Amino acid sequence: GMSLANQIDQFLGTIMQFAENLTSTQEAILMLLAEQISTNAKIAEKLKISPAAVTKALKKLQEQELIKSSRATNDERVVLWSLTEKAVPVAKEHATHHEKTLSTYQELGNKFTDEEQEVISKFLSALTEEFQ
Amino acid sequence: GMSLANQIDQFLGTIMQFAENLTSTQEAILMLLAEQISTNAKIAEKLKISPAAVTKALKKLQEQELIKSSRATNDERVVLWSLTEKAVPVAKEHATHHEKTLSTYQELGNKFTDEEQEVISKFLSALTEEFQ
Secondary structure, eight states: OOOHHHHHHHHHHHHHHHHTOOOHHHHHHHHHHHHOOBOHHHHHHHHTOOHHHHHHHHHHHHHTTSEEEEEOSSOTTOEEEEEOGGGHHHHHHHHHHHHHHHHHHHHHHTTSOHHHHHHHHHHHHHHHHHTO | OOOHHHHHHHHHHHHHHHHTOOOHHHHHHHHHHHHOOBOHHHHHHHHTOOHHHHHHHHHHHHHTTSEEEEEOSSOTTOEEEEEOGGGHHHHHHHHHHHHHHHHHHHHHHTTSOHHHHHHHHHHHHHHHHHTO
16 A cells, blocks of 8 residues: 555646746736726735735736726826736636636535535645745 | 636746756666666666666766766676766765655654545646646
């Protein structure tokens, strides 16, 4: 039989191999803008990142014509950002992938009782640490 | 609070990030040869790989002067392979890393009862599948 240590080793090897086959900030803005027009400030708050990081990601998305700025109809000083037509199916495709992935994790989790899920949760947190 | 699905998603993201920061056959031969001189046949059996794959990996290791061929003192037709002096500390360093990694997984596993470990084992097998 196989030790749990070896099972864990093999499992992590499989996830790392799969890895070896848009930044995440950019893709998170895409997803956010897919749901509501927003400002730099709003984006920084919702994403929990610095204003410099938001400006940097917004610039990359703009260069790619994934998003576009406009002026708040109420206030001429506030710049709003929204998806371009070109970005609509990009964001939709990313949102769908994310949702499907999470659904898969959720269905797997649902095969376990709350008590079992707590075991799994503690296991994953402790193992996460070894990789942070 | 955070759903298990989201915990799993974040956990896999961390392992994949860590990944984004010698082939495994070659390194397995190094480790094997670190413990005993062997032939192509022996290597293929122990590693569960094709003779072509072994020849391919042996050639790469030889080019790198990590291993060297010699003739079986008993039989002139059989080629044995062993580490070179240069490879000794390479294999030692790899063996030590592997052992340390497994020790870490083992110590983490030891914080869980056999029953909890079974929960974790089933969880990991089912999740592995999603990535094979």
